Amino acid sequence: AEKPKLHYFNARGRMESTRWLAAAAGVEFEEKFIKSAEDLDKLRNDGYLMFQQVPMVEIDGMKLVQTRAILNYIASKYNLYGKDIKERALIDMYIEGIADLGEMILLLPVCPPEEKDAKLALIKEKIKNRYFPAFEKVLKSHGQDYLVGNKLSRADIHLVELLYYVEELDSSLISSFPLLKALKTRISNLPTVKKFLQPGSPRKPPM
């Protein structure tokens, strides 16, 4: 078959969690960077973007836009979405929480300086009182190596992706959560993830 093709800017943005997930799944893919406005216009004009926006991933005859659509399909194809419907609910619950926190951090740079030193305080407070304790609690509930069904899933990947960004913001934030640390160590040590974390992978830098 043809290798999936990822169309985005040569940046993290809204395409990174897809890069992490496909790499974690050991899926080989090609990137096509948008590097000019005219490049993006090429895409619209050719009819490649349903809602005129990227990320778009070409995969299995499809031109999938919308991060959640692209990720849902990849997680499913490569068996990282639970073994049943109830497992998918826990997974969706977890990863939607991660997306919410993700979202905040993603857009934190593109706001005013006036709204900034409170939005940061508000992010850090939610990490430490809402988000991190909830994932710790889940890992403590079962004592197992993965978040769901004692098997690696997209929740592990997306959370560990998130714990990497949380590190860049403030490395002290995980410090009271030992099981999250252990998870971040365990997942970074999986062969595919470890390859992704190595220099030269498709992992992107911060802005």
Place this chain on the structure above:
Amino acid sequence: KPKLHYFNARGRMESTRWLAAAAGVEFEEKFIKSAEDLDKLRNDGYLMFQQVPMVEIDGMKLVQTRAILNYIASKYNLYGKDIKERALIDMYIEGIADLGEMILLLPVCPPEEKDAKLALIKEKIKNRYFPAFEKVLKSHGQDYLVGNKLSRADIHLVELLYYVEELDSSLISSFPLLKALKTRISNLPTVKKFLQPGSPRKPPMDE
């Protein structure tokens, strides 16, 4: 019977009310009225991220809108036949949610920004979203968005068409197929029942 915990309002629960009801599911609701109605669910451990919507369903307490919806869509055979169908469904409904979201928080928009944000929402409706969906209907000529059969995508799009009608009734005017769909979907027994006075269908907010 599933139990919706939300405020007595549309909010982030309404699209679940539509979907439950389209699928012939009787649910109960439990309305939060005070900040200490909310505060009870948090300390009771009922909310994973201390937030509503929450649905009690099949022994789970599911939070996050997308988790609830995905679960209900699959359980009631409204999520397509396979992963490729779901992907087209996901692509479509995430587009819908993106527009839904802009419309959902128009009321809470800073008042000096409201004029531009409203004007931008209409531009997107007219140029981005409504044509994408007209083009889909026109490409297969079939009565439903996906798989020649009822899916959550038809339900979510129709719901949106009603919020767009409340905003500006001219917007749908040159989208014949969107018009045709809104009509056919609103005459499905369960939906017609939902649109009738005295259902769990919630009003627009006003203050």
